[model samples]
Target: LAEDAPWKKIQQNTFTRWCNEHLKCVNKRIGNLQTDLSDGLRLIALLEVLSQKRMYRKYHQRPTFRQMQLENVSVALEFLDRESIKLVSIDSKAIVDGNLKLILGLVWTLILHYSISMPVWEDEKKQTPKQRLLGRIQNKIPYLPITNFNQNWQDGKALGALVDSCAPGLCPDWESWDPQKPVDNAREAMQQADDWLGVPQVITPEEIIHPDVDEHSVMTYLSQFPK
Candidate 1:
C-alpha cells in the first residue's frame, strides 16, 4: 500500500487489472448500451454503497411494521414467467398494492447480481487462493428494465382482480397501450421529462410511483390536511 513497498505496488496493478476484468465481465453482458460510463458500472458502485448503508441501518435502526408490510408485498414477484402467462387472478387485490413493480425490481436485481459477481470462476489463468476464495456475496443488485412493468400487460388478459389489487384504477387502456409504441414514447419523454417538469433528476430516491397514485391521489391526501 505504501510507495516504497515493492510487493504492495506490484499487487496494486494486479488488483486494478482484476477489477478491470471484472468490469468487463459485467459491462459486456448487460442488455443495453456498452459505453465508457456504463449503467453496469453505476449499478455495481451504487449497489456497493447501498449494501453498506443497508447493513449499517439494519444494525443501528430497526424497521417498523409498516416497512415490513411493504417489504412482504415486494417479495411476491415471479421472474421467469413467459411473456403471455397470466400469473395472478383477475379478481385478486395483489394488483393494487404495487406488488408487481416491487417484484419485478427484485427479480431484475437478482439476475444482475448472479450474472456479475462470482465466488469461484475458473478461467484458464491460475488465480491465487485468495481470489479463488473471495466471498460470493454482493452488496446490492442492478436495476430492472424500464419497460418490463408495462411490457407484462401487453399480451396478458385483463384480470380485473389482479390489476385492481396491485394498481387501483387499473384501466384496461393503460395496460393495453401499444407496448412498443408507448415505451418508445415514454422512454423519450423520460429523457425530457425533467426539463419539461423544470426539475433536475426530479424523481431522486426514485420512489416507486404506482399507476394509481397520481395527481388525483395527491389531491385526495391534501384534502385531509389539517385546516
Candidate 2:
C-alpha cells in the first residue's frame, strides 16, 4: 500500500481542499453573477465560465499520474482558463439566450465526467499490483461528494437547486431535471472543448448507470464524505 500513500496525501491535501473551495467559490460567484446579470445569455455565459473554472481546477490538481496524463491535464486547464477569460469579455447579449437548459446540461456533464467518470477510467486502467494498491488507497481517501449527483438527483433530491437559487429561472424545475439530457448536451460541449483545446476526448460516458439499481449503496458511499 506504500504506493497509495502519495495518492492519499494528494487527495487529502490537494484534491479535497480544491473541491471544497471550488464548490464554495462557485456558489459565491453564482450569487454575484445573479445580481450582475439577470436570466439570459449573459447570465448563462458567466455561469459557463464559472463552471469551466471549477472543472479546470479539478483537473489542474489531479493526483500524480502518468506523464502523458499529467500533461493533458495541464493543457486542458490552460485551455479552460483561456475560454473563461474570453467568455468574460464577450457582451452578455451577444451570446444566445433561452439556453439555460443547454448551459446547465453542459455544466453538470463536465462535473460528472471529471469527478466520476475520469476516476473510474483511471482505476480501470491500473494493473493488478496498481489495482491492489488503489483498493487500499480508496479506503483511506475521503469519499468525494461531487461524484454522487446522479443518485442524489434520482432520489427526488434538488441536486441543482443552487443554480436556480442563484439565478432564478436559470434552471426552473431543477428538481425535475433529467440526467440524460444534460449528459447528452455535455458530450457535445465536451467535444467542442476538446477540439478547441486540442486535447483528446477522455471524459466520454461508457454507460448510464440508472438511479434504481443499487442507488442505496451509492448514497451510502456519499454519506461517508461529510462536509
Candidate 3:
C-alpha cells in the first residue's frame, strides 16, 4: 500500500496530453498532404498527355521548356514518394517519443513550400498558350489551398509563433532556419529519431515509377523525331 511512492503522476499526465495533441496535429496535416498529392498526380498525368501530344511546342521554339517541366515533375514526384514513406512508417511509440513532431514538421514544411511555389493558371482574359493549357489541367485536377508563407510569416516570425503553439515549449531557432537548404536536414532528423527509438528506417521500393523513366519511354515511342 504505497500511495506516494517514487513516481510523479503530473509529469506523466502532461506528457500523455502532449503526445496525444501532437499525434492529432500530425495526422491532420498528413491527411491534407495526401489530398494534395492525389491532386498533384492527376495534374501530372494530364500534363504528361499534353506533352506527348506536342501541345507544349505551340508556345516555345526550343525543347528547353519541355525539359524544365519534366525535371520539375520528376523532383516533385521524388519528394512526395520519399516523404510519404517516412510518414506511414511513424508509429504510436515514435509519436510519444517526440519523433512524430520532428518528422511531421519537416514533412509539412516541404509540402507547404512546394504548394506555395508550384505554378498554376489564374488570369482568364490575358492568357498565353501555356497558361491556357495549365487552365485546362486545373479544370480537370482539383486545386489544394495553400498559405503564402512569405506574406504570412514575414521572415519566420509568424512560423515560429505557430510552431510554439503546436508544440508548447519546444521552441525552435527560427533565425538559423533556411528555406533553401537541401532536404538533408529532414533525412537526418528522421534517421536520428528512428535510430534513437530502436526502430528500422523505412525502405522505399525500387519499382516506383519516376518521371525520367516515363519521359524516356515516351520519347522512345515517338522515334520518328529529327535525327
Candidate 4:
C-alpha cells in the first residue's frame, strides 16, 4: 500500500532532504533513507548531531549481523525514548527491516520533532520555514488544497494565492486562470510576487508548474513570501 501511494515519493523526497539538512552539519548525508538508515550509523550520528550528546551504551562500529543492526537501531530508538520523543507504532525491527511505511513514519516523526517543533534556529520565526509561508497564504486561500509541494502546486493557484496574500488584489483574477493554462497563471503570479513583495524569482514560472515540482526550488521561492 505504501509503495503505490504516489505521494509517498513526495513524502520521501521531503523527508530525505529534511534529514540531509541536519546531516550536512555532521558531514554525512543519505541518498535513500530505506537503505542508508538501515545500518544505524547514520541514524545514531543524526541523533548525536541533533543533541550534541553520546549514546549510553556501546554499539558495533562494524555491525555485520542482523542482530547488530537491530540492536543499533534500538539504541537510536531508545535514545529517542529517553529524550521523550515518542515514535508511535515504530520499533527497531521496522527500521532494521527497512519497511517503507514505518521508515517514512519514523523519519516524518523525526522531522516533526527536530525541525518543525524544535523552534528552529534564528528563532521566533514561528514553526518551520514552510509552515510560516503556508500560514501566510492559508489565511487567504481557503478553497485550495494546500498540501505538499507536489502536484498540488502545478495548477498554479497556490502560488497565485500566495501572491494575493502578500498584497491584496495583486493577482485579483487568479480564480479565472484555469489549471490547464498553468504557464500564464504562474508567470503572472511570479511577476506579482516578485514585483510587489520583492520576492525573488527563485524558479521560473514553467519550473513551478511542472508535473513533479522541485521541492527545494519551490521552498527557496516561498521563503521569500513572508514579509
Worst 10 residues of 4 by lDDT: 115-124
- Model 1's C-alpha root-mean-square deviation from the true structure amounts to 23.8
In the range 109-199, model 4's lDDT, one tens digit per residue, is 6655654455433223535656754555455567776666657678887778778866889987778789888888899999987788876
lDDT of 2 by residue, 1-227 (tens): 45543322222222222223344534523332212222332233333443563333333233233443344334443454555422123222322232332333333333333433234432243343224333433442334233332443342223234223333454456445565565543343334334443323322222112322232222222222211
TM-score of 2: 0.24
Show model 2 residue runs off by greater than 4 Å: 1-27, 32-98, 120-227
Query: Ranking under lDDT, best-scoring first?
Result: 4, 2, 3, 1
Candidates sorted on TM-score, descending: 4, 2, 1, 3
Predicted model with the maximum TM-score: 4
TM-score of every prediction relative to native: 0.19, 0.24, 0.16, 0.61
lDDT for model 1, on a 0 to 1 scale?
0.26
Cα RMSD (Å) per model? Answer: 23.8, 19.8, 23.4, 6.8
> Candidate 2 vs candidate 3: which has greater lDDT?
2
The global C-alpha lDDT for each of the candidates, from Candidate 1 onward, is: 0.26, 0.33, 0.29, 0.73
TM-score of candidate 4 against the unseen true structure: 0.61
Which candidate model has the greater lDDT, 1 or 2? 2
